[PDB]
Amino acid sequence: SEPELKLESVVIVSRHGVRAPTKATQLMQDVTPDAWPTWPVKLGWLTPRGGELIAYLGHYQRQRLVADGLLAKKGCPQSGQVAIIADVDERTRKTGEAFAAGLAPDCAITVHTQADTSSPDPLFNPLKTGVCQLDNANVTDAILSRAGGSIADFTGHRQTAFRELERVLNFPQSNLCLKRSCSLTQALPSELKVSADNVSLTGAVSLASMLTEIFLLQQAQGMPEPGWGRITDSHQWNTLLSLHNAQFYLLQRTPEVARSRATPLLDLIKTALTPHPPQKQAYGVTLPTSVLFIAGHDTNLANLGGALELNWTLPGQPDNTPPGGELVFERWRRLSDNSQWIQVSLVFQTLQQMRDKTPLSLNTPPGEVKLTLAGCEERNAQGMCSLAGFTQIVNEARIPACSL
């Protein structure tokens, strides 16, 4: 009659699953009297449990996609109906594989990646390979501004979280305080480093962002007493991860950085989402197709968010860009007039579902937040943006010099 919609295409940009953190550094040992628990998995790689959590999301997406009638209830999807693209790293490739394994167990679905997995793939970061550069001065002013004026100010307004972190580390008893009134942000002054191909923060901010992530990973891994048992309630988890999210806020979401870093992905997403006769694209994958799954990093998720003006907080998940988190783009066609609509949402397992490793399904689904494209003006009752509105947003967000 008029409101009915049909799902025709889905694009999932996912962060890889939980990966074992790299060997602990001297700085890490110097900030806490306690020893960092070791990880029984090749460090830096996807843990097998991490692979399982991804598989659960794959199993969930299959049920959901069958219910929306995009994929068949049984058997393997048609060839080229499902396409998976992954960054060259081990954790991203194995994430693609675990997802495929959960979505269609026993089916042969290829995980496409650049052939040369020993060099970076510019799709995931064009700055890395020199496709384009950042404007140093503009990036510096923009980041300093979102920070409140200076990194000192940024750090000053967040002492609550820094103290919580010190507490968890039992900082006052570490070699850094002893061999010095002992403050973490005071002990490791933080500075902004801007270069044509990269932006980073040093000192406390950077260390705190890394350390708070490690705790969440211990929890997600199922390791006993993460943080030496000093993190006991949800309020602490959120306060701690607020430091990790704050760094992403400055380095990955800032528009003058995000727009360039995300251009190649924006182009791919737009092409995958635009109705058009199928043709061979990057990695020899055929687009458009039914389901496109891209295995990337949290930086990719934050970059797309900043570039498309998508903001979110995830109930039950302190990390805004959690392992296995999925940025889902969907194209829906209104049957009455053939108009196209784009829905964007963030699918993710809550910290508890990761902890208990709870299997996902239609009855026990992963967490999910519907998003709204801030700049979109042509919406429907479900909050979806028109294909034209979404396309316009993308064309103005992308940086032409950064396309591949």
Curated annotation (Swiss-Prot):
Known outcome of mutating T22A: Retains 20% of wild-type activity with phytate as substrate
Effect of H16 to A/G: Loss of activity with phytate as substrate
Record annotation: effect of changing P21A: Retains 70% of wild-type activity with phytate as substrate
Impact reported for T22G: Retains less than 10% of wild-type activity with phytate as substrate
Effect of C376S: Retains less than 10% of wild-type activity
Induction: Induced by phosphate starvation, anaerobiosis and entry into stationary phase. Regulated by the HTH-type transcriptional regulator AppY. Negatively controlled by the cAMP-cAMP receptor (CAP) complex.
One biological process term in Gene Ontology: cellular response to phosphate starvation
Outcome, altering R19A: Shows residual activity with pNPP as substrate. Loss of activity with phytate as substrate
Cysteine disulfide partners in this protein: C76-C107, C132-C402, C177-C182, C376-C385
Entry note: thermal dependence: Optimum temperature is 55 degrees Celsius for phytase activity. Optimum temperature is 60 degrees Celsius for phytase activity.
Effect of T25A: Retains 80% of wild-type activity with phytate as substrate
EC number assigned by the record: 3.1.3.-, 3.6.1.-
Entries under InterPro entries matching the protein: Acid_Pase_AS, His_Pase_clade-2, His_PPase_superfam, Histidine_acid_phosphatase
Recorded effect of pH on activity: Optimum pH is 4.5 for phytase activity. Optimum pH is 2.5 for acid phosphatase activity. Optimum pH is 2.5-3.0 for acid phosphatase activity.
Oligomeric and partner information: Monomer.
Entry's family note: Belongs to the histidine acid phosphatase family.
UniProt name for this protein: Phytase AppA
Organism: Escherichia coli (strain K12)
